[PDB]
Amino acid sequence: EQIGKLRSELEMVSGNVRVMSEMLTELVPTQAEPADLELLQELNRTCRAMQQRVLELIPQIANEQLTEELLIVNDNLNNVFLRHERFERFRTGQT
Protein backbone atom coordinates (compact mmCIF):
# COMPACT_ATOMS: atom_id res chain seq x y z
CA GLU A 1 0.00 0.00 0.00
CA GLN A 2 2.32 2.73 1.29
CA ILE A 3 5.13 1.47 -0.94
CA GLY A 4 2.98 1.86 -4.05
CA LYS A 5 1.79 5.27 -2.85
CA LEU A 6 5.35 6.49 -2.34
CA ARG A 7 6.33 5.14 -5.76
CA SER A 8 3.43 7.05 -7.32
CA GLU A 9 4.64 10.20 -5.57
CA LEU A 10 8.14 9.62 -6.96
CA GLU A 11 6.62 9.34 -10.44
CA MET A 12 4.97 12.74 -9.97
CA VAL A 13 8.30 14.12 -8.77
CA SER A 14 9.96 12.70 -11.88
CA GLY A 15 7.30 14.54 -13.88
CA ASN A 16 8.39 17.75 -12.16
CA VAL A 17 11.98 16.86 -13.01
CA ARG A 18 10.96 16.50 -16.65
CA VAL A 19 9.38 19.95 -16.55
CA MET A 20 12.57 21.45 -15.13
CA SER A 21 14.69 19.53 -17.63
CA GLU A 22 12.62 20.93 -20.49
CA MET A 23 12.92 24.52 -19.26
CA LEU A 24 16.60 24.11 -18.42
CA THR A 25 17.24 22.86 -21.95
CA GLU A 26 15.04 25.18 -24.00
CA LEU A 27 16.08 28.31 -22.11
CA VAL A 28 19.51 29.93 -22.39
CA PRO A 29 21.59 30.10 -19.22
CA THR A 30 23.23 33.36 -20.28
CA GLN A 31 20.03 34.94 -21.57
CA ALA A 32 17.58 33.53 -19.02
CA GLU A 33 14.98 36.13 -18.07
CA PRO A 34 14.39 37.17 -14.46
CA ALA A 35 10.86 35.79 -14.78
CA ASP A 36 12.17 32.51 -16.20
CA LEU A 37 14.68 32.17 -13.35
CA GLU A 38 11.96 33.05 -10.84
CA LEU A 39 9.81 30.21 -12.17
CA LEU A 40 12.82 27.89 -12.16
CA GLN A 41 13.62 29.00 -8.62
CA GLU A 42 10.13 28.21 -7.33
CA LEU A 43 10.16 24.82 -9.06
CA ASN A 44 13.67 24.23 -7.71
CA ARG A 45 12.35 24.93 -4.22
CA THR A 46 9.68 22.29 -4.79
CA CYS A 47 12.32 19.85 -6.04
CA ARG A 48 14.40 20.60 -2.95
CA ALA A 49 11.40 19.84 -0.74
CA MET A 50 10.90 16.58 -2.63
CA GLN A 51 14.62 15.90 -2.32
CA GLN A 52 14.33 16.06 1.47
CA ARG A 53 11.26 13.83 1.28
CA VAL A 54 13.31 11.27 -0.64
CA LEU A 55 16.26 11.53 1.75
CA GLU A 56 13.91 10.79 4.65
CA LEU A 57 12.60 7.67 2.92
CA ILE A 58 15.81 6.11 1.61
CA PRO A 59 17.02 4.89 5.00
CA GLN A 60 13.48 4.07 6.10
CA ILE A 61 12.59 1.96 3.06
CA ALA A 62 13.90 -1.60 2.95
CA ASN A 63 12.08 -2.36 -0.29
CA GLU A 64 14.65 -2.68 -3.07
CA GLN A 65 12.36 -1.37 -5.80
CA LEU A 66 11.15 1.71 -3.93
CA THR A 67 14.63 2.41 -2.57
CA GLU A 68 16.00 2.21 -6.11
CA GLU A 69 13.34 4.69 -7.24
CA LEU A 70 14.24 6.95 -4.32
CA LEU A 71 17.92 6.95 -5.28
CA ILE A 72 17.11 7.60 -8.94
CA VAL A 73 14.83 10.53 -8.12
CA ASN A 74 17.41 11.89 -5.68
CA ASP A 75 20.04 11.92 -8.42
CA ASN A 76 17.63 13.54 -10.88
CA LEU A 77 16.76 16.26 -8.37
CA ASN A 78 20.47 16.89 -7.83
CA ASN A 79 20.87 17.30 -11.59
CA VAL A 80 18.03 19.83 -11.64
CA PHE A 81 19.54 21.71 -8.70
CA LEU A 82 22.99 21.96 -10.28
CA ARG A 83 21.58 22.81 -13.71
CA HIS A 84 19.51 25.61 -12.20
CA GLU A 85 22.61 26.84 -10.37
CA ARG A 86 24.41 26.88 -13.71
CA PHE A 87 21.63 29.04 -15.15
CA GLU A 88 22.07 31.54 -12.32
CA ARG A 89 25.86 31.56 -12.66
CA PHE A 90 25.78 31.99 -16.44
CA ARG A 91 23.19 34.77 -16.28
CA THR A 92 25.10 36.70 -13.62
CA GLY A 93 28.45 35.89 -15.22
CA GLN A 94 29.87 34.24 -12.11
CA THR A 95 30.47 30.77 -13.54
Topology (CATH level 3) of domain 1-95: Methane Monooxygenase Hydroxylase; Chain G, domain 1 (1.20.58)
Torsions phi, psi for 80 (to 5 deg): -65, -45
Give dist(CA 75, CA 81) in Å, integer.
10
Q: Are 39 and 23 in contact (CB under 8 A)?
A: yes
44 closest CA partner among 90, 72, 79, 6: 79
Cα 63–66–72 angle (5° rounding)? 135
Radius of gyration of the chain (CA): 15
What residue segments make up the domains of the chain, in order of their start? 1-95
